[PDB]
From a paper:
pmcPARP4 is an ADP-ribosyltransferase (ART) that uses NAD+ as substrate to add ADP-ribose onto target proteins, a process called mono(ADP-ribosylation) or MARylation.
A double mutant to glutamine was created for the two neighboring lysine residues (K23/24Q), thus removing both charges and potentially limiting any redundancy or compensation at this location that might have occurred with single mutants. The double mutant K23/24Q led to the most notable increase in thermal stability. This local increase in hydrogen bonding potential conceivably contributed to the increase in thermal stability of this BRCT variant, as an increase in surface hydrogen bonding is a common explanation for enhanced thermostability. We analyzed the mutant with the strongest phenotype, K23/24Q, in the context of the BRCT-WGR-CAT fragment of PARP4. The K23/24Q mutation was also effective at considerably reducing vtRNA interaction in the BRCT-WGR-CAT fragment, and the deficiency was comparable to that of a complete BRCT deletion.
Author numbering: 4 to 96
Amino acid sequence: GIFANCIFCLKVKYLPQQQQQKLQTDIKENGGKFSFSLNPQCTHIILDNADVLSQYQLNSIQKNHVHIANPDFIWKSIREKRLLDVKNYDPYK
């Protein structure tokens, strides 16, 4: 699937539960994995609008080359059946 070899840290606790679950199944059904914790194996971190990252988390992200993206990155990649340009979905741009 389009998310093969992607490991997403999910920080989307302010989304409705149905959307959180749909994010998870969209990721799993398309070859990806997710965790709720940020670690060096994460390739991506998905961040809803209301969630924030500490300086520690930002330092880890930079160190491990983690891509910061909003939920639209997942939604739109699924909709277009193609992994999109994650750089177009960076809230911390």
